[model samples]
Target: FKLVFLGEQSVGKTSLITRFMYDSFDNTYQATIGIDFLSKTMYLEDRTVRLQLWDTAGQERFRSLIPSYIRDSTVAVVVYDITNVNSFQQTTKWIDDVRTERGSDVIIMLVGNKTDLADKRQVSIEEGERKAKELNVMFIETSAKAGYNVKQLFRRVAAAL
Candidate 1:
């Protein structure tokens, strides 16, 4: 299974992946220049599945390079920072681009990350869920900092594939 993370810059895409893979988080902000890949193998229903996760740069300047990363992906995890409404808003374009390049049957998960900072959240859970429903995709709120829903998110994606 291949999964791609797409969203605007500083949307916690890398942090969430890092937390899921290493159970750790970093405060520093560094843009993802091109793409980063990670692999994990797990048992699923009496079978072993290999997940090839791809992390893409979120900056608008890097949008032109997204198609290559998104190509051949079985699942696309569209993530956004709950604290940044703009990031959430930009998910529409990402989804559109992915659908245009990948296709209608490509599984997508609308993830609202950074839920640990709920106090500063600008995009409400209801809003995110609504958007996901509109796009016919799964939606969940996560907190990489506190390790909330990180495993569930990936499990859901893997199962979907």
Candidate 2:
């Protein structure tokens, strides 16, 4: 299964993916050039699966490889930083790009990151929940820096896959 992490720059897209990778979230874009394996794989009794991550910058410089891949994913992730409420503004448009107006059965989920920055947290949990309800998607918050709420996300995606 696949999931695309879409959000504004520095909103912890890479960090979330890193925490998902089970390590210090990659703040730089270098590691995700292609399929960055999760350092290792979780072995199952009869089946095995690997979690992969991808990186980006403006997401256009790469020959503008737009629409090049349909992202036939199990879910599409929309991320934002809790400390920066401004990040939430982009959610609608990004979700629009994935679901379009016709709508899709895709499992799109929303994630608010950086819970450790509680002192500066501008986006509240209630807001995220309300937005999720409005958009009809799953929602959760995480603090990759301090390793909080990461498991909740991984399990949800794992379950979906």
Candidate 3:
């Protein structure tokens, strides 16, 4: 299945993916200019699935390319940084695009990344949950820096398949 990860720039969207796939987090990495593809086989208790991940650029210049990626996706992992309130708020538009493209056919997950930054956290877990509940999507908190909940995050996505 295809999964597209979306969010604001520097929101740890890439970090979460690398932490899950490579088990390492790079402090700096190249942003997706238009779109980039990566694949991973997720082993779950029930079964395994190969996820074709579309890593999208988060800038407005690249906004035109996002919906096309979401259009054929089976899942959308809309992510945000826990320490950035604006990043959290920006997810609405990304989720909106997914809905606009795929409607209820997509499994959208609202991911609050960087759980290790609770001291600097501007987005509350409750707030994430509330938004997800209001939008009718799944939600979770993760810390790719410290490698927390990254695996289980994708595992949940795999099981959702």
Per-model C-alpha lDDT, please?
A: 0.87, 0.68, 0.86
Candidate 1 on 1-161: residue-level lDDT in tens? Answer: 89899888888899988988788988889889878899988774456888788999887776776787788688999999999988999899889988898778789999999999968989999999999999888899999889999988988887787
Q: How high is each candidate's TM-score?
A: 0.93, 0.79, 0.94
Q: Where does candidate 1 stray beyond 4 Å?
A: 44-47
Model 3 C-alpha lDDT versus the unseen true structure: 0.86
- Please write out the lDDT profile of model 2 over residues 1-161, one tens digit for every residue: 45567666677777877676656764455423432323346542234656554444324344133232225445677788888877887777777776762266677779898888889989889999999999988899898888887867867766766
Question: Could you say which candidate leads in TM-score?
Answer: 3
Clashing pairs in 2: none
Clashes of 1: 0
RMSD of each: 1.5, 3.6, 1.2
Using TM-score as the measure, name the better of candidate 1 and candidate 2.
1
lDDT of 3 by residue, 1-161 (tens): 68899999888888888887888887775676878889877665467778798988887798786767888789999999989989998889889988888888889999999888879988888999999999989999999999988878888877787
Q: Model 3, residue 57: displacement in angstroms?
A: 0.6
Off by over 4 Å in 3: none
